[PDB]
Amino acid sequence: ATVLLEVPFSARGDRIPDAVAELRTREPIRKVRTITGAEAWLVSSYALCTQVLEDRRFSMKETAAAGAPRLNALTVPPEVVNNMGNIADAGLRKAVMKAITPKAPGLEQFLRDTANSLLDNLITEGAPADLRNDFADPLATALHCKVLGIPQEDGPKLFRSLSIAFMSSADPIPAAKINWDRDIEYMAGILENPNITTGLMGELSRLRKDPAYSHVSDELFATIGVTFFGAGVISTGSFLTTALISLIQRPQLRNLLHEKPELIPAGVEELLRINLSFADGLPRLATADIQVGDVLVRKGELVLVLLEGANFDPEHFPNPGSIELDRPNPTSHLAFGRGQHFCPGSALGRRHAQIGIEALLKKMPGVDLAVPIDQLVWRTRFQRRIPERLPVLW
């Protein structure tokens, strides 16, 4: 006899388990068990992932309901799961999004300079270098500090909350509350800080004093800075790191982008499509009985949308395991989600990786793993799959 199939299948972000294809072919929606012991539906075909993400009756908000089947424990106050709905209601949606485009003046030059300088330093210290801790993460952290308008020097302390903040835990994490509360006081201080006038926090400080926002709470303003810092640094640093590994593992692809750097955008778009950085399916709670393939999902039940199920579905991406820079549907992957909660930092996520890859390829054209790929240590019980250290030589 066997327990119900458990998720996640594997912390490894350098290979998709064979089980995913088997599941997608035989059972594109099946019952699994999460780390909390709750039952959920795993959706692993493009068509069904797309359906669940586009049907708002599969609610993100409701996952936070007391007594709901859970993927993992909340690392935030329950009202913060409705973050984007709260931002929408307070009239802050247009302002938040305009503040987080890679289109801001001199932001790209900032990324480029920062990536180059992180890289010059690696080269000066000599190989082996750690591309996660000493390149991709400081790059992400530096980008979000610039973007928020906060001092660069504050980034590493805020960054160190993230190994806890993005845990995927069966149980509540005392440390997450500590960090959350601390980082919220930090962001509040920043709203009251007369020198913080640029980026997202500079803008939020203005709107805060505007009579049109007089009834928006201080908690929400601080929450926006903590959440956008955390979600963004975690997501871009994780993505970049594992996209480097895929790049490294493909010297032919790396050559091509080195010769023809104008293909880098088309490359990152494939790197996003194939990325395994999201460790768990996207959770949603059925607010009604909804047919999904052969299964009638009952109101109250948890549904997990498996992003690599969609992104490696051969019915939508032929030869899905393969990076092809000339697919006719290149950006239709679900790497940023789909429908109501589509990632608001997608343009920023894209530029960060394009530039980080671009600079890496110029400075380190012979970049290569300095250990066998199996030696990478994968972070467990975490909402991203990342190698703890990315040791490389060049």
CB nearer to ligand HEM: give 128 or 337: 337
Angle at 379 between CA 376 and CA 383, to 5 degrees: 135
Phi, psi of 167 (to 5 degrees): -60, 145
The residues in 89-128 that bind ligand HEM, with binding defined as CB under 6 A, are: 100
277-296 mask for ligand HEM (x: CB under 6 A)? -----x--------------
We find the least distance from the C-beta atom of residue 12 to ligand 5MK, in angstroms, to be: 24
Answer whether 123's CB lies under 8 Å from 365's CB: no
Strand partners, 391: 130
> What is the strand order of the sheet 129-130 is part of?
129-130, 391-393, 368-369
CB atoms < 10 A from the CB of 252, how many? 8
CB atoms < 10 A from the CB of 156, how many? 13
Q: Does 183 bind ligand 5MK (CB under 6 A)?
A: yes
> How many chain residues bind ligand 5MK (CB under 6 A)?
12
CB nearer to ligand 5MK: give 75 or 114: 75
341 makes contact, choosing from ligand 5MK, ligand HEM, none, with CB < 5 to 8 Å by partner type, with ligand HEM
By CB under 6 A, which span of 16-24, 146-154, 173-181, 260-268 interacts with ligand 5MK? 173-181
Answer whether 70's CB lies under 8 Å from 38's CB: yes
Secondary structure (DSSP) of 244-269? HHHHHT-HHHHHHHHH-GGGHHHHHH
* Cis status of the peptide bond prior to 8, with omega within 30 of 0: yes
- Residue in the block written with tokens 């768990």: 280
Q: Does 232 bind ligand HEM (CB under 6 A)?
A: yes
Among 86, 161, 205, 227, binds ligand HEM (CB under 6 A): 227
Tokens representing 186 are: 């930090």
Q: 145: annotated binding-site residue?
A: no
176 makes contact, choosing from ligand 5MK, ligand HEM, none, with CB < 5 to 8 Å by partner type, with ligand 5MK
CB nearer to ligand 5MK: give 114 or 179: 179
Q: Does 180 bind ligand 5MK (CB under 6 A)?
A: yes
What are the counts of helices (DSSP H) followed by strands (DSSP E) for the chain?
A: 15, 10
Q: Does 343 bind ligand HEM (CB under 6 A)?
A: yes
By CB under 6 A, which span of 179-187, 331-339, 366-374, 375-383 interacts with ligand HEM? 331-339
**Residue 298 to residues 56, 290, 291, 295, Cα–Cα distance (Å):** 15, 7, 9, 9
Among 196, 348, 357, 364, binds ligand HEM (CB under 6 A): 348
CA distance 168 to 384: 9
Annotated binding site for heme: 343
Annotated binding site: 343
| Residues engaged in binding ligand HEM (CB under 6 A) | 60, 83-84, 100, 227-228, 231-232, 235-236, 239, 282, 335-337, 341, 343-345, 348-349
| Residues engaged in binding ligand 5MK (CB under 6 A) | 75-76, 161, 165, 176, 179-180, 183, 226-227, 230-231
